[PDB]
């Protein structure tokens, strides 16, 4: 239930989430493991149009593992693991972990992480008497193991919890997008309003001030003393009703976010 809750939480924020139910052999007591995989670490065939996911030809699962774990995972091919792409998401996470700091004196002892990609693909068979799933685990330069799926069910372990799916290109997107752009607009409105409050705009007669640098520096200061020429008018506080206008615009955008259970029902279904 925690895995399912996290998966749906990700399907809310981003397009989709993946929950996998498979059978694994290890010293771990539980044979049938059900664990979450992030949307980052799963690459799925986009040609599928079926809601079930049967038309999904192949699923790729790039995973980042330590060399000791990866070598312990699959035997008889440790040399290839020792000798040994990706999207910016998981690569960015791994490279941020590797970077530590901007400029760092890394010691001799460094944890080595390798990328293993697990691929499940479907190929037609047409027995005389049709779709048989085969597992494929491959590193960057070689494949560790190739074989058919031992499980009787002829579908991949990873099941995608869909969300809002784009009509044109058939790719999922999260709840956020519209809230996202209205949110960035709200942030712009708030920043603009705060600036307008802080700094005065000055339109002046050409000979208003004797010293323009001190004037420019000390317009905003509440304690400043401003020296001006007799007949050259200074217009401070030129446009400040813009503050109220931008605040009203931000409030209106908040109201539109409110407008944009029954509406969310497709995600729950």
């Amino acid at each position: 239930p925690f895995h399912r809750s996290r998966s749906f939480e990700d399907t809310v924020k981003v397009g989709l989430g993946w929950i996998e139910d498979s059978y694994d052999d290890s010293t771990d007591g539980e044979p049938i493991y059900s664990r979450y995989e992030s949307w980052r670490n799963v690459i799925f065939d986009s040609a599928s149009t079926e809601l079930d996911g049967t038309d999904m030809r192949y699923i790729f699962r790039p995973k980042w593992l330590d060399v000791d774990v990866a070598c312990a995972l699959v035997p008889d091919r440790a040399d290839e693991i020792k000798k040994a792409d990706g999207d910016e998401a998981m690569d960015w996470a791994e490279f941020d972990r590797d970077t530590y700091s901007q400029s760092r004196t890394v010691s001799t002892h460094k944890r080595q992480r390798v990328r293993l990609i697990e691929c499940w693909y479907r190929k037609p068979m047409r027995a005389t008497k049709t779709m048989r799933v085969r597992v494929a685990i491959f590193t960057s330069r070689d494949l560790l193991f190739e074989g058919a799926s031992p499980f009787r069910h002829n579908r991949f372990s990873l099941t995608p919890i869909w969300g809002f799916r784009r009509g044109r290109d058939n790719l999922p997107y999260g709840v956020i997008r519209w809230m996202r752009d209205i949110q960035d607009d709200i942030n712009k409105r708030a920043s603009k309003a705060l600036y307008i409050l802080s700094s005065n705009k000055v339109v002046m007669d050409e000979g208003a001030v004797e010293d323009i640098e001190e004037f420019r520096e000390e317009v905003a200061r509440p304690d400043a003393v401003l020296v001006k020429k007799p007949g050259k008018q200074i217009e401070l506080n030129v446009d400040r009703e813009l503050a109220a206008a931008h605040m009203d615009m931000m409030s209106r955008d908040i109201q539109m976010l409110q407008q944009v259970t029954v509406a969310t029902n497709k995600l729950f279904d």
């Binding site: 924020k13 397009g15 949307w39 790729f60 999207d87 956020i176 996202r180 920043s191 705060l194 802080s198």
Partner: protein
Amino acid sequence: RSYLHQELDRQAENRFQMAVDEDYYDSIQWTEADAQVLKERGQAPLVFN
């Protein structure tokens, strides 16, 4: 590997969009350029989230 490359480069737009969505979720909503613009104003960037 060819199939994985095709999947990665085809999905790159929507994967990047979902990454930016997850980033805006946790109160990170300022573009670097606009954050610099605000910094030159002397104004601390704020996210209402």
